[PDB]
Amino acid sequence: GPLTRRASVGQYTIPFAFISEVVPGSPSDKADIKVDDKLISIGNVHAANHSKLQNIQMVVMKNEDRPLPVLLLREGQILKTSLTPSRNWNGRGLLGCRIQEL
């Protein structure tokens, strides 16, 4: 994550899962998610409240066809993207990636 800087004039950070596979053409692929990304948040689900991942399947089903915010750690950088869970692609389920706990 970012190094500490002095406060200046002018957010989840804790990884909890990782992405081990991404099906080409899936919603996860379209969201620019990559193998080995670490998941920091998906919708309202983050390290403190994912309930051993069960809250993810619920959140993605409820958000079918609607964009969800995703925070991930890639190569040490926190990236913000969005994923639209959907069935309309050539594969199984709403996501097309495998998400496992760290």
Author numbering: 115 to 124, 129 to 220
Publication passage describing the model:
The RP-specific chaperones Nas6, Nas2, Hsm3 and Rpn14 are important for the assembly of a hetero-hexameric AAA-ATPase ring formed by the subunits Rpt1 to Rpt6. The PDZ domain of Nas2 binds to the C-terminal tail of Rpt5; however, it does not require the C-terminus of Rpt5 for binding.
Since no crystals were obtained, we created two truncated forms of Nas2 with the goal of minimizing the sequence around the PDZ domain. Nas2LND produced well diffracting crystals after two months, enabling us to determine a structure comprised of amino acids Gln129–Leu220 in the asymmetric unit. N-terminal residues from cloning that spanned Gly115–Gly124 could be traced in the electron-density maps. However, residues between Gly124 and Gly129 were disordered and could not be modeled. Following refinement, recurring electron density was observed in two regions. Nas2 lacks the GLGF motif commonly found just prior to β-strand 2 in PDZ domains. The absence is not surprising as the Nas2 structure shows that β-strand 5, instead of the common β-strand 2, contributes to the putative peptide-binding groove, causing a different loop arrangement. The reported Nas2 structure will provide the basis for further insights regarding the structure and function of Nas2 in proteasome assembly, as it will facilitate molecular docking of the tail of Rpt5 as well as enabling the design of Nas2 mutants based on the putative binding region.
